[PDB]
Design a protein around this nucleic acid. Sequence first.
RNA 1: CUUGAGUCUCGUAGAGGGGGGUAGAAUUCCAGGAAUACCGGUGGCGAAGGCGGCCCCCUGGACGAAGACUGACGCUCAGGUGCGAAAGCGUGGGGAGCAUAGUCCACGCCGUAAACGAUGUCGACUUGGAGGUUGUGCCCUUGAGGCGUGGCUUCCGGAGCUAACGCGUUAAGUCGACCGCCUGGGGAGUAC
Lengths: 86, 49, 79, 129, 77
Amino acid sequence: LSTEATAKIVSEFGRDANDTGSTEVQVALLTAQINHLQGHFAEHKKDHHSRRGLLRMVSQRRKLLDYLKRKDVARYTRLIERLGLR
Amino acid sequence: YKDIATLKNYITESGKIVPSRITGTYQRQLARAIKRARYLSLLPYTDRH
Amino acid sequence: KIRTLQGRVVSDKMEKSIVVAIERFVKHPIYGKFIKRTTKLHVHDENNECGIGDVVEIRECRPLSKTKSWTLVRVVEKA
Amino acid sequence: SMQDPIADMLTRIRNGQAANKAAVTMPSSKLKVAIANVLKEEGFIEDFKVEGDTKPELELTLKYFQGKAVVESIQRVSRPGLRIYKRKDELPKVMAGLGIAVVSTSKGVMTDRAARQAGLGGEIICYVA
Amino acid sequence: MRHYEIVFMVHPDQSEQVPGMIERYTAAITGAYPINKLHKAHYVLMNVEAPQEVIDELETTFRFNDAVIRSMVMRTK
RNA sequence: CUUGAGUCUCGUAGAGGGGGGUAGAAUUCCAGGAAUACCGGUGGCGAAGGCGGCCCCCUGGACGAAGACUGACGCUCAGGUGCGAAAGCGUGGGGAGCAUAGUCCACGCCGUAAACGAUGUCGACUUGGAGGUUGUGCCCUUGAGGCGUGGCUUCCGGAGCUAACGCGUUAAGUCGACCGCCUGGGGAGUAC
């Protein structure tokens, strides 16, 4: 969720060490943590409180993808290749 | 939460929970500690039963 | 050569014919505010040498079809 | 500032004209050096020192002659989204011309006499009185 | 994983079956007032290490038991 | 390029929920429906309606102490789509506390209200004073304790403002960007 499996996914995308909040490393950490949280909303199906917190970061997932879109068309396609998006 | 001494000196002899407004003290941890106090069997249910 | 009106491409589902919008500022006539206003005019071109999303230079011409009186001159932008 | 650096500066200065502090300070862009190098020269305030190189920032010295404070009624007019690009033969004279009218000309910001001397107006920055 | 703790209450007339029940429920350790009674017993507690699923087999064996009545699990970090 | 914003580390406090069973300080009938006495408050959570037994389970937000790197990536909103106090109604049961279904769980409609901080939102600036609560740096910590220094919430008050009454560092005060809404009362939240 936050500590263990994030620590094995951090260096899978960084252009060097500790570049953590770069936009490549950003979304791939985040989109991963929408699939796994959707396992939690694969059931329980009445938590309308927390569901906006999911709905929060799903829109921000598309927000930073605009920042790949407007700057570098190449690196945009490279990670949605590696994630299979849209 | 689990101590027979440091919790039962800070319960009242009517069985109930001491308020901090009379005790004067950690209380927000102590309250929930005495909220769950009823199953430990180091205490009664209350002093009258 | 007129002003060489710069514009974009909106859609091409037509046979050798495109749709161009044009960015354009103006003073709003009573309030004094700048509203970015755009128009929409059909433009003749044969080669399909501009794609949907480019930036286009346009002059007028003879009125060829209905609803279309502008030829392409050249393109300054890829898709 | 968030969404105008020069408007939110003009709140910061004349709040010093309501408690009579000595020195005022705001985070200072290169435009902001060119602001108070007009207010000093026309005489409305006294002295300023830029400092900082990762936070370039000013040390303006106020000017209150008495309990009365010198910079009486400064007003920004051209606020973003309501640009008023004045042609020069409309020009705002401030308080029958007795003040000054800071106009963003080509040749600089320093503007009383763009009416005749320079000879080209532009966007008003703020009236000053 | 996550550290845990075991809390339960022991039947007095079958307080002789304490360590026999212990080695039964040590399998998960190696795998990873009138309450109608005397109000007199002895407690057995320990701080255990097991993760989120190895524990789940343990508690669902107490609706078939008669000595212990209440199953309580806490933590201390 | 690093301060707006944002991810990581790391701790901290908590009626944020969802499910699962649990179960008495209490309480009618011949079994069980209910839900807190205490803590319970000027506390405390959350975007609001709200939400209080206890433990674990999947999840939600905020906070602090440092570092680290991203280099404007943001703020706002017509329509739009969700969450939506009671009742009512639908279909499927129950029947004590006690209103004869309904109230209660549940699957569907229904979107209603003092759903009234009768105070859109974010940002930056300006005399303040006393209490709340959460931290945590320095300091014989030599302690219940000081100076700071974070965050939100009270209580009275300067200038300024307001028709007054009053607001008053959590604004309504000086401003900037954007959205909702009003233009005399009745007929009327009605005719089609």
